[PDB]
């Protein structure tokens, strides 16, 4: 595709999950941010596409699936068919990327967002394609058992400013965090 976007919320050790869920209790605002970003297309008639792995899909409460107003694509090598609610199943990122370029998807799709987990982020980070990484850095340590892959600081340059992203440190439920945008230009 033209360029990828990835979004993640990470705690201090770069953890993103624990026991199949997020490491911290709910942060309404951080979450509305993930909704607002993944949901908003800049072209009437289109919806964005969200690509995620098996586990991340099942982590979403069942009545809340698929993420409303985005085309849900699940990646799995072990599944034969798109889990109940998913729009599409794909065997790999590559495969997902080609689906997106197909006729029927192409004119339907605005932005592509990788929503994890680890293995999906990694694979996307490695593509020699223009990529913007939206990271929420939660300034606190929660035990995590899943982690965010290492970003190559030589490729992914942190932007000092980006539109519609608060610059200041944020607080909610006694927790502080900040939004950061990393950009890879090929
Ligand atoms: N903080 C955040 O922003 C954030 C975002 C997402 C998830 N999370 C947390 O992370 C956890 C889920 O992450 P996870 O890393 O364990 O799992 P995952 O990536 O969500 O799911 C893994 C499975 O998905 C398929 N898959 C993954 N990468 C693939 C690829 N490149 N090509 C093909 N198939 C691929 C494979 O399924 P098969 O075994 O069927 O082949 C792999 O077993 C939960 O705790 C979730 O709450 C946090
Ligand atoms: C899609 C599911 O909620 C998943 O765990 C994700 N959560 C988050 C995310 N991105 C942010 N910033 N915050 C989340 O809570 N990406 C994916
Ligand atoms: Ca497996």
From Swiss-Prot:
Keywords: Methotrexate resistance, NADP, One-carbon metabolism, Oxidoreductase, RNA-binding. InterPro entries: DHFR, DHFR-like_dom_sf, DHFR_CS, DHFR_dom. One of its GO terms (biological process) is tetrahydrofolate metabolic process. It comes from the Eukaryota. The keyword NADP applies. It catalyses: (6S)-5,6,7,8-tetrahydrofolate + NADP(+) = 7,8-dihydrofolate + NADPH + H(+). GO terms for molecular function: dihydrofolate reductase activity; mRNA binding; NADP binding. Pathway: Cofactor biosynthesis; tetrahydrofolate biosynthesis; 5,6,7,8-tetrahydrofolate from 7,8-dihydrofolate: step 1/1. One of its GO terms (cellular component) is mitochondrion. Key enzyme in folate metabolism. Contributes to the de novo mitochondrial thymidylate biosynthesis pathway. Catalyzes an essential reaction for de novo glycine and purine synthesis, and for DNA precursor synthesis. May bind to mRNA. This is Dihydrofolate reductase. It comes from Gallus gallus (Chicken). The gene is DHFR.
